[PDB]
Amino acid sequence: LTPDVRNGIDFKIADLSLADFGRKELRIAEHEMPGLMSLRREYAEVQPLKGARISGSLHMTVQTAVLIETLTALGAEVRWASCNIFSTQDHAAAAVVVGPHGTPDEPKGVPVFAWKGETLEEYWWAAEQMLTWPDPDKPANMILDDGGDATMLVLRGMQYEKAGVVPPAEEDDPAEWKVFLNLLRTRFETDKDKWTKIAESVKGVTEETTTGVLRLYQFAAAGDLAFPAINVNDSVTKSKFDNKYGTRHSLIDGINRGTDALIGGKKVLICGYGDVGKGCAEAMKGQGARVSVTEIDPINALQAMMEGFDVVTVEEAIGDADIVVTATGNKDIIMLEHIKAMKDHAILGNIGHFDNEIDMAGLERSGATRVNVKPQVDLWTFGDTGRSIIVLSEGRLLNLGNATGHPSFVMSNSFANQTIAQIELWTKNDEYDNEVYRLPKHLDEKVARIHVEALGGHLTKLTKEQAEYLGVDVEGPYKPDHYRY
Amino acid sequence: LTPDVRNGIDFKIADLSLADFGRKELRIAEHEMPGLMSLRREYAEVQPLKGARISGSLHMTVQTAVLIETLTALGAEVRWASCNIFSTQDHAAAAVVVGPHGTPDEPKGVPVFAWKGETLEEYWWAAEQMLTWPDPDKPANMILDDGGDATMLVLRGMQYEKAGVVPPAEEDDPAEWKVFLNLLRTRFETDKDKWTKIAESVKGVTEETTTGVLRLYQFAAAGDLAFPAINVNDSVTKSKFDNKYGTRHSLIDGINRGTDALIGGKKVLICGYGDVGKGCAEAMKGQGARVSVTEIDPINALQAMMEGFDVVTVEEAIGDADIVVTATGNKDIIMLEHIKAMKDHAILGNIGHFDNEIDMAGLERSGATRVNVKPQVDLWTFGDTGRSIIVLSEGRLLNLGNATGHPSFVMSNSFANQTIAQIELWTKNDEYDNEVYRLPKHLDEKVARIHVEALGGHLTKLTKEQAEYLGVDVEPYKPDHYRY
Amino acid sequence: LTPDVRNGIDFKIADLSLADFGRKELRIAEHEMPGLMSLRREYAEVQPLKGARISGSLHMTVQTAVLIETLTALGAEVRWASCNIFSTQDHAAAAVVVGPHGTPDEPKGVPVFAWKGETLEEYWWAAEQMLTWPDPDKPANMILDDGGDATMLVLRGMQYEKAGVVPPAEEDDPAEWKVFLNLLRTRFETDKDKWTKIAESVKGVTEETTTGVLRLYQFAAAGDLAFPAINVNDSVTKSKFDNKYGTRHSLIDGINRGTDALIGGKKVLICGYGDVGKGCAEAMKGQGARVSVTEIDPINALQAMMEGFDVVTVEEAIGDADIVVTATGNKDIIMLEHIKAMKDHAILGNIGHFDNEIDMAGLERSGATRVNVKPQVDLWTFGDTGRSIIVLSEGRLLNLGNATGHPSFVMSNSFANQTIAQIELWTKNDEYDNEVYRLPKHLDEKVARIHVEALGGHLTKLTKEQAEYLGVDVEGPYKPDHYRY
Amino acid sequence: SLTPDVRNGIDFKIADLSLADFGRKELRIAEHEMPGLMSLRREYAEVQPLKGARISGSLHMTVQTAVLIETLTALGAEVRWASCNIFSTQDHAAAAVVVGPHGTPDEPKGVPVFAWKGETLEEYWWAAEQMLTWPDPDKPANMILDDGGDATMLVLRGMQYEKAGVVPPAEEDDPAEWKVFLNLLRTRFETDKDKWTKIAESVKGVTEETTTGVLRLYQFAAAGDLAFPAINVNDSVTKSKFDNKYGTRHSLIDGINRGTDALIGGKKVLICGYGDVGKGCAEAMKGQGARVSVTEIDPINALQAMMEGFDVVTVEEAIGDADIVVTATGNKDIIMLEHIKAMKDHAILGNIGHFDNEIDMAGLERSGATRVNVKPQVDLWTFGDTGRSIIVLSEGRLLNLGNATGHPSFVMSNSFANQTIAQIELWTKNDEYDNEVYRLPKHLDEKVARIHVEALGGHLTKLTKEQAEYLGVDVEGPYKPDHYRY
Ligand SMILES: NC(=O)c1ccc[n+]([C@@H]2O[C@H](COP(=O)([O-])OP(=O)(O)OC[C@H]3O[C@@H](n4cnc5c(N)ncnc54)[C@H](O)[C@@H]3O)[C@@H](O)[C@H]2O)c1
Ligand SMILES: NC(=O)c1ccc[n+]([C@@H]2O[C@H](COP(=O)([O-])OP(=O)(O)OC[C@H]3O[C@@H](n4cnc5c(N)ncnc54)[C@H](O)[C@@H]3O)[C@@H](O)[C@H]2O)c1
Ligand SMILES: Nc1ncnc2c1ncn2[C@@H]1O[C@H](CO)[C@@H](O)[C@H]1O
């Protein structure tokens, strides 16, 4: 694989002729993303992101296209790739390359390396394209990450450079780990300090998802976080809105498009009851499902029980479930022995950021036979028991793989937060050390206020006497730092 | 257009090569349709529909496909068309023509005249193909109808043949009415008693939906119901499950695939609160929408308010609605004046059986301009205000237009009812007069019990003393007027 | 046990002094019962119930009080008793005897024989007083019944008079069957045709509840229904609102006042899923309960499953239920064997019309020991296992036992239905045979319209073209007779 | 002038000691629904961690609180109690606490309680002073257990006025309760000049149970006036996200039911505030078929309300259409006289926040509206100028405890397990604390949730070693980062 280059723009996508359809959907989404449109208006004259060379790794969807065109409206240059092999919306990839005033013959947009249905090798090739700016002396200077893959390639790449060697992989390492190290080992043959110089140049990363933020905390603990990070997942207007209400919308959409399976009346097992598992359980309850939940954390478990759900183990419940969904952010939730315990024509999916919640390696090597039904839907049959299971998106996050991910108006909260985090890190970069930060409460309130307004809600304004009573300013922030909402 | 013919089967569909894909979905659907599979097993030996020549007008979906193959398993011959221009699922139509054991080169299934995105003239052409059996002495002898268009073609066609003329249309008559009359008028130039002869041969009709049943009541009140009918829509296991729970599933699905618009937080206006409007409001509420409802019937309105929804008129709430769904079975619910009042980028769709709940004709001649976004999704802009509305399925039923209609496990209730009714009408035909009937309660209980078992529910069995106390048999459990 | 007499009114109640308190609540109920108030206004001049002498057997609550004073406003005379030993609200009984313009020393309302906490003997004594008008030439001429006990005393009583004997009770007939047969046998010693004369004089009965209507069909099938009946339970505005939304309100109220037990997080078993069971499950699910449902009817079971509830048997689920509610109208749902299987401190109650859904007789003779906690709440302990169960209302309907029954705005639908039925049977009496009838749909629609307006709902008016398309009158009725709403 | 009753050497003031048998039956039922407290009694029985503590507790004297007090004494503490609201006490539970599990009304074996349902303001502050004044002048209170901060306010303001040498006069337009509070302090200062200072000096810490009290603690700490360590129990995860939310989902509708019996389904309901209590209120009403709108100042909470299906509206625009109006803000001046006069005829008005000043009751009472009492804690106020009447619950005091019985035992077992642990931590590890507001470590909140999951029969999954390593947590927890919001 080699990049296409048209009118001086390098990229790799499914089909540039999808641009007109992508544009139409982008325009509809701008009307549903007031957080982004408000930032474009507010920062238009200032051009806060001038001089930024942002390397972005985030599902290449309609919603992300409105984010990329906000970063460029605000002065940044970007290069983009998806953070999952199935999450790209090819029409939005084409509209980003062509830009709002370009055409497929005369594209005026930005470099995108993303299509729906990548292989592992192609995913990592695309991530290196997205991180590799064309002037050796102007490498990337910011990262915008969802899941931490862009940050991992940079920091691991530098670690192996400083060690003088890319380790061999073990035979029993996951396939993707072998691909990742192959990419790094190969580049190190011909370029000995690429990643060190990129890490040096990067002024900060913004990280969008609970899984990526866990990895940031694990780099910071090891003394390896080489630039400041803003944990955007934990903006109040991201975690409590995207993770929860986003998933309430998009889980059932993925299930619907993949399977068309009636949800009402079915037993549904949701593994994990954090913000995503709360959204899943709310979606399924609302469609008439009989929902049970698994958990390791007794606080979240007590919430599930308070919300009308039994709290059970996968060992006890797996044989009775019609639909099983993993939502933990952890690995090894649904192992091969659990899959072989499922009832005939049960459905299995994962909505967590990575596919290793479901033992797909074990399933693929087990001797079960696969019939592909349609893209991202496979029927796996075990000849020993006779039973077949429907697996969505090969265990990758099913809302993006089987449908279109969260809706624009939800993503307007997450991406307003991301945009503000990118502005803060770029323009006030000296104020940040090499640690993980969260945005101040006032800026999350700012984001929520734009969306209340857009939905026609009417905020009450505190009187002077009331503000004094609460010990807050009339304009906020209104809550203490540890407030949980 | 003329029909295609291959291996002795006449048909008109989008693409035979889709049969493989459709067959994989049909097989998964069979595991989700225990009502139909239970009937295939029960009646396999008896072959109750041997001799039946069933003309079917019903959305050509994966679910219909399992129904069609249950009829043919039971001994019937069939010819099929969709009952809407956008509701066909092309891979299902291909699998039905090819059959379980056929191939696209050598198909071995049954005649289907159906594709997604028919024009009006093509829809009525296909309906005439579906009702026209190849041997003139063996015309259709049963109809299986959803919405009454097959029934109306036969009964109106006979009416004109008896009058000796097909009347002209009026200039202000609907476009679809002109097409319908053109078909009948054209045919009556070469064939003077085609529909009269079909009418005579048809032993009965089964009708699947609320709008179709109203039309049967209207034919029957005019003294024009020429053959018996079973109202399948009003089986308990149909109206209270398909119209309500089916729509709870498929309305969100249609809206999602057409628009990907967040439902939570939005103001949603549902017009009508019968079983389909009750399923729409339950779906929307479940996604966190702020739902209001319109209604003419004070009983249904009081239910909506007891279920946590304001009951408002279109005039008062149209200006602020983010999504508007018509679910009435009536006409003229969202007129052009209301559409001009909508907020920018609001969404408008209909889930009733016919498009005339929304004033599409008014919209198409208003001076608003259309941009097609993707199939069945159009953006209409009024330049005087600058505001745009997203219209789903050009006003046609959005769950089947924009998505896949109700899920198979729901359609298994409706289609087990329709298969029982076809059986009852065909094998006990002399017991029925020319009136509309509903299935006895015990046959509805039998369809419910197949699905409770499929879901793992555990029924209690009455003791002899309890059965005596209630005055029921241990095996129907409710009075005839019971409402569930 | 003899009636009290004051200012020309015979009555038996707890305490006349409660009349002021009762009257304040009656006045507030009148604002919440626009169905009854609209009927008082409508028929004020006509006086349609002039000449009626209505014997009423119906829970003597604040809601029934507004019904009683609507019947008297329309010209009827009345004599009343409760239809359950624990459902009376003493301050309502006192306001009804005193009247809107009386005082406790000089009452000016109507005969009431009802108090909360009757014995069985007192219950049947009161039922006889209510059915026994003072002038033997003017016996009762209508019955207004809820549960059919008034109707049963009249028709069985006549039945024994024509046989010339009241049959002896069997040793293992229920305690209340013996009481009932003792009343009739004692009266038959001094009066040989009392019940025969009342039955001849009764021109109609209106029957308010599912269990009463069932008994009406059983009388009718036997050839023994001596006068016309209107089944008020099966008014659309009764069954689908009182039985369902009434119960959604008053089930949790009963369990709250009896036990104050958290409902959220708890496993709750609802026996029966008709309109009452549907309201129970909806109330419990709304409080975060984990609800399962039992059923004999596959159609109601499939609804419960489609509404997110497992459908289980008592035997499978009884051991782990924290709250068990019987809602069937049948008998022998929770037997002694099931109660010994309950978890310690589980709560057991019945909301169907009669206590025999729960095997109280078996409990009372089991060797378990009772400790009364407060009125209508008892703790039963089995010393063999050490476990105790909380029993509400000694098995009698708990919403009225432990709390105040359905709220006034619900009872306004049921009681406008019952007032219209009394009007129709009394004024159009020649139109009816000795069969059970239901009110015409337009009278149900009229009752709904009054409450829609009271809540501020805004009905759409059909155009002439729309009414022609539907084949309906613009003024209704709007649905076919078999429509199920 | 009230004086304590003294029986068998126990000083108290309650409605009726003969209710103790009925109280005890309800306490023993509650022990079965309070596994958090029963587990702590078993765990710390032998240790007696609270020996030497003299805890002055100010918290709604309900059945649930009685199981908390008996947990504190089981663990070695001595106590003296009072309610933190004039209508919240459950007289049978007050009687059972004085009599104790082995005492009788003639021979009580319990502890000093100064609480009954229906106190006047004067009696409420008299009772608060009894609760804070231990009998040995040389053994004053050494811990405070507070809900709403009233006990902490009397001690800290009492000491402030002592150090100043004067209790300030009240302003004519000060609220009535403020005039009572200063009267109490001004009178005691006449005869005892250092009472509150010695108390403040003896108190080793306070635990504070509610969002209102915790605000007041932050306000003392801001001003340099928090004279001893405080633990904010409100903000334990298993308190704020359980009690505030699911407790209120149960008890709001209970209080509305017992006061009014008004159908909730089909009514328009206005909830003012969408924090944890307003979320519980809206979930309760939604589940009963109400049509709910929400008011809010905070755009984050408002956006959650809209995402959960509720319009976000101002009181000015929605007040005239509301059938029921509930305040759940913790602020003051939410529903003013002008808004009351705007309500529809026979609308219901109540407050569920800790203090009654959310509803302008002073303005209502001085307006010229006429009051008819319907029954305890239910009043019908009529405006002769408009002809409209409104039903007001609990004279504006928290309606779940005033009109019903407050949150259910099983919910309070979380709050009171937290409070009991907080009291153990502050008494036994006192040198580890400065004069600041603290929250309990996350591991202890997990411990409390786990007792309740187990009691409900939920089954927790156990992390494998590999999973624990992947997450970077211990298999035994804690499982979430410190800023985790659940
Ligand atoms: N799309 C689908 O999958 C699907 C499924 C089942 C039924 N249907 C169709 O949906 C439609 C409704 O079916 P149903 O079973 O709910 O019928 P219904 O008769 O039970 O309900 C329709 C409701 O609309 C109300 N109504 C009529 N005119 C109105 C007006 N002008 N404004 C407001 N409300 C009005 C009526 O009072 C009635 O309660 C029919 O056309 C039916 O054939 C579609
Ligand atoms: N307490 C109240 O205020 C109140 C209100 C309305 C009705 N009622 C009473 O409630 C009872 C139920 O009324 P309804 O209108 O719901 O009647 P219903 O006939 O609509 O429903 C009862 C359900 O019980 C089911 N059932 C019968 N026997 C059973 C068994 N052994 N196990 C499981 N399920 C069984 C039936 O299948 C039926 O669906 C009647 O006694 C009625 O008079 C009480
Ligand atoms: N439509 C979408 N476009 C871009 N990102 C999305 C979309 N839906 C979900 N996500 C993001 O995917 C992340 C997990 O990789 C979540 O943190 C969520 O914000």
3-state secondary structure chain D: CCCCEEECCEEEECCCHHHHHHHHHHHHHHHHCCHHHHHHHHHHCCCCCCCCCEEEEECCCCHHHHHHHHHHHHCCCEEEEECCCCCCCCHHHHHHHHHCCCCCCCCCCCCCEECCCCCCHHHHHHHHHHHHCCCCCCCCCCEEEECCCHHHHHHHHHHHHHHHCCCCCCCCCCCHHHHHHHHHHHHHHHHCCCHHHHHHHHCCCEEECCHHHHHHHHHHHHCCCCCCCEEECCCCHHHHHHHHHHHHHHHHHHHHHHHHCCCCCCCEEEEECCCHHHHHHHHHHHHCCCEEEEECCCHHHHHHHHHCCCEECCHHHHHHHCCEEEECCCCCCCECHHHHHHCCCCEEEEECCCCHHHECHHHHHCCCCEEEEEECCEEEEECCCCCCEEEEEHHHCCHHHHHCCCCCHHHHHHHHHHHHHHHHHHHHCHHHCCCCEECCCHHHHHHHHHHHHHHHCCCCCCCCHHHHHHHCCCCCCCCCCCCCCC
Q: Which of B357, B441, B5 is nearest to C482 (CA)?
A: B441
Specify the ligand 3 atom closest to the Cα of A61.
3
Task: Compute chain C's Rg from CA coordinates.
Answer: 23
The alpha-carbon gap from D266 to the nearest alpha carbon of chain B, in Å, equals: 4
Cis bond before residue C407 (omega within 30° of 0)? no
Fold of the C1-244+406-457 domain: Rossmann fold (3.40.50)
Q: What are the φ and ψ backbone dihedral angles of D381, each rounded to 5 degrees?
A: -105, 130
Indicate which atom in ligand 1 lies nearest the CA of residue B277.
16
Q: Find the helix or strand (DSSP H, E) in which C436 lies.
A: strand C436-437
A405 pocket-lining for ligand 3 (C-beta < 6 Å): yes
Q: Which chains touch C (3 or more CB pairs under 8 A)?
A: A, B, D
Task: List chain B residues with CB under 8 Å of C217.
Answer: 471, 479
Q: What is the distance between the alpha carbons of residues B139 and B227, in angstroms, rounded to a whole number?
A: 15
Return d(Cα B250, Cα B253) in angstroms, integer: 5
Characterize the bridge pairing of strands A377-381 and A388-392. Answer: antiparallel
Question: Does B457 contact C at CB distance below 8 Å?
Answer: yes
What is the sign, positive or negative, of the torsion defined by CA atoms of B146, B147, B153, B155? positive
Q: Distance from CA of residue D377 to its chain's centroid?
A: 18
Q: For residue C254, what is the DSSP state?
A: H
d(CA C462, CA C467): 6
Residue B330: burial class (beta carbons within 10 Å; 0-12, 13-18, 19+) = buried
- CA pair distance A459, C198, nearest whole angstrom: 67
Helix, strand and coil content of chain A, in percent to the nearest 5, comes to: 45, 15, 40
CATH 3.40.50.720 domain range(s) in chain D? 246-406
Contact D54, D78 (CB under 8 A): yes
Interface membership of B219 toward C (CB under 8 Å) = no
- Answer whether A454's CB lies under 8 Å from B262's CB: no
D485, A241: Cβ pair inside 8 Å? no
Atom of ligand 1 nearest to the CA of C462: 31
Cα separations in angstroms, A249 against A284, A422, B256: 10, 27, 9
D219 with A471: Cβ contact below 8 A: yes
CB D240 within 8 A of CB D445: no
Alpha helix (H) residue ranges in B113-209? 120-131, 149-163, 175-190, 194-201
> What count of other Cβ atoms lies within 10 Å of the Cβ of residue C385?
12
Q: Give the gap in angstroms from C-alpha C266 to the nearest C-alpha of chain A.
A: 8
CB contact B387 to A (< 8 Å): no
Architecture of domain A245-405: 3-Layer(aba) Sandwich (3.40)
Give A410's contacts in chain B (Cβ within 8 Å): 262, 264
- Residues B419 and B43: their CA atoms lie apart, in Å, by 11
Q: Is D363 annotated as a binding residue?
A: no
Report the alpha-carbon distance of residue A146 to residue A88 in Å, rounded: 14
Kindly report the backbone phi and psi dihedral angles of residue C51, in degrees, each rounded to the nearest multiple of 5, phi listed first.
90, -10
- For residue A396, which ligand has an atom nearest its CA? 3
Written out in words, the top-level CATH class of the domain with range D246-406 is: alpha beta
Strands (E), C232-272: 267-271
Q: Which residues of A touch C289 (CB under 8 A)?
A: 308
By the 10 Å C-beta count (0-12 exposed, 13-18 middle, 19+ buried), C13 is classed as buried
B99 is in an annotated binding site: no
Chains with ≥3 CB–CB distances under 8 Å to B: A, C, D
Contacts of B186 (CB under 8 A, 6+ apart): none
In what order do the strands lie in the sheet containing A267-271?
A: A310-311, A290-294, A267-271, A323-326, A347-350, A388-392, A377-381, A369-374
Count of alpha carbons within 13 angstroms of residue D205, beta-carbon side? 27
Give dist(CA C142, CA C56) in Å, integer: 9
Distance CA C144, CA C209 (A): 11
Tokens linked to C239? 């069954």
D147 is in an annotated binding site: yes
Measured from the CB, is residue C211 less than 6 Å from ligand 2? yes
Half-sphere exposure of B303 (CA within 13 A, CB side): 25
Ligand nearest to the CA of A61: 3
Task: Flag whether residue D317 sits within 8 Å of chain B, measured between CB atoms.
Answer: no
Query: Which ligand 3 atom sits closest to the C-alpha of A404?
Result: 1
List binding-site positions of C. Answer: 61, 146, 208-211, 238, 242-243, 272-277, 295, 330, 351-353, 399
- Tell whether omega for the bond before C34 is within 30 degrees of 0, i.e. cis: no
| CA proximity to C327, closest of C292, C299, C377 | C292
Tell me the helix, strand and coil percentages in chain C, rounded to 5.
45, 15, 40
- Among B217, D481, C355, residue whose Cα is nearest residue A216: D481
Cis-peptide, bond into residue A477, ω within 30° of zero: yes
Q: Can you list the positions of beta strands (E) in C126-280? A: 142-145, 205-207, 229-231, 267-271
Considering only alpha carbons, which residue of chain A is nearest residue B260?
A407
Nearest ligand to the CA atom of C466: 1
Q: Is the CB of A89 under 6 A from ligand 3?
A: no
**C-beta neighbour count of C220 within 10 angstroms:** 14
Nearest residue to A358 (alpha-carbon basis) of A373, A374, A345, A342? A342
CA-to-CA distance for A236 and A248, rounded, in angstroms?
17
B/e letters for B220-259, b = 16+ CB within 10 Å, e = fewer, are eeeeebbbbbbbbbbbbbbbbbbbbbbbbbbbbbbbbbbb
Query: Shortest CB distance from D250 goes to which of C264, C390, C410?
Result: C264
If you ran DSSP here, which 8-state letter would residue A351 be given? -
Q: Which residues make up the CATH 3.40.50.1480 domain(s) of chain B?
A: 1-244+406-457
Q: Do C298 and B449 touch (CB under 8 A)?
A: yes
Q: Which residues from chain C sit within 8 angstroms of residue A273, using beta carbons?
A: none
Please, are residues C209 and C58 in contact by the beta-carbon 8 Å criterion? no
Atom 5 of ligand 3, residue of closest alpha carbon:
A59
* C250 and C302 Cβ atoms separated by less than 8 Å: no
d(CA A398, CA A396): 6
Chain B to chain D Cβ contacts (< 8 Å): 32
Euclidean distance between CA atoms D271 and C417, whole angstroms: 34
Bridge-based pairing of strands B9-13 and B112-114 is: parallel
| Ranges for all domains in chain C classified under CATH 3.40.50.720 | 245-405
User: Going by C-beta distance under 8 Å and a sequence separation of 6 or more, which residues neighbour residue C68?
Assistant: C56, C78, C80, C96, C110
Nearest CA in chain B to D283: B308
Is A308 labelled as part of a ligand binding site? Answer: no
Method: X-ray
Task: Output b/e per residue, B187-201; b: 16+ Cβ within 10 A.
Answer: bbeeeeebbbbbbeb
Sign, CA torsion C470/C472/C473/C474: negative
Please, are residues B264 and A245 in contact by the beta-carbon 8 Å criterion?
yes
Residue B146 is assigned to a ligand binding site: yes
Gap between the Cα atoms of B299 and B302, Å rounded: 5
DSSP state of C403: S
Residue A105 vs residues A5, A98, A110: alpha-carbon distances, Å: 11, 9, 14
Q: Could you tell me the resolution of this structure in angstroms?
A: 1.6
With an 8 Å Cβ cutoff, are A310 and C302 in contact? no
Measured distance CA(C29)–CA(B326) in Å, rounded? 38
Place of tokens 């009669």: C354
Which residues does a 6 A CB cutoff place in the pocket of ligand 1? B 209-211, 239, 242-243, 246-247, 271-277, 294-297, 300, 327-330, 333, 351-353, 397, 399, 405-406; C 460, 462, 466, 478
Cα angle B289, B291, B295; round to 5: 160
Searching chain D, which residue's CA lies closest to the CA of residue C32?
D262
Q: What is the location of CATH 3.40.50.1480 in chain D?
A: 1-245+407-458
276-295 in A: which are within 8 Å (CB) of C? 285, 288-291
Where are the alpha helices (H) located in B44-144, listed in sequence order?
Answer: 62-73, 90-98, 120-131
Beta bridge partners of residue D81, listed in sequence order: D57, D113
Annotated binding site of C for substrate: 61, 146, 208, 238, 242
B454 interface with C at CB cutoff 8 Å = no
As beta bridge partners, residue C291 has C268
Integer Cα distance of D440 and D122 in angstroms: 35
Element (H, E) at B230: strand B229-231
Q: How far apart are CA A165 and CA C356, in angstroms?
A: 82
Task: Please give the Cα distance from C321 to C334 (Å, whole number).
Answer: 12
Chain A 77-136, residues with CB within 8 Å of chain B CB atoms: none
Q: Any CB–CB contact under 8 A between D459 and chain C?
A: no
Give the pairing of strands B388-392 and B377-381. antiparallel
Place of tokens 């995913």: A123
- Give bridge partners of residue B142 from the DSSP assignment: B54
Alpha-carbon distances, residue D166 vs A100, D176, D187, D193 (angstroms): 74, 20, 11, 10
Among candidate residues B191, B186, B128, the one with its CA nearest the CA of residue B154: B128
Q: How far does residue A263's CA lie from ligand 1's centre (Å)?
A: 23
Q: How far apart are CA A342 and CA A350, in angstroms?
A: 15
Best of C59, C353, C485 for a ligand 2 pocket test (most atoms within 8 Å of beta carbon): C353
Packing angle of the helix pair D409-428, D35-44 (nearest 10 deg): 30
Output Rg (C-alpha) for chain B, integer angstroms.
23
Which residue of C lies nearest to D405 if distances are taken between CA atoms? C260
- What is the rounded CA–CA span in Å between residue C20 and residue A219? 75
- Strand pairing class (B229-231; B436-437): parallel
Pocket of ligand 3 contains residue A64 by CB under 6 Å:
yes
Place of tokens 């927890």: D477
Give A50 to chain C, closest Cα distance, Å: 52
What architecture is domain D1-245+407-458?
3-Layer(aba) Sandwich (3.40)
Tokens 């005026």 found at: A108
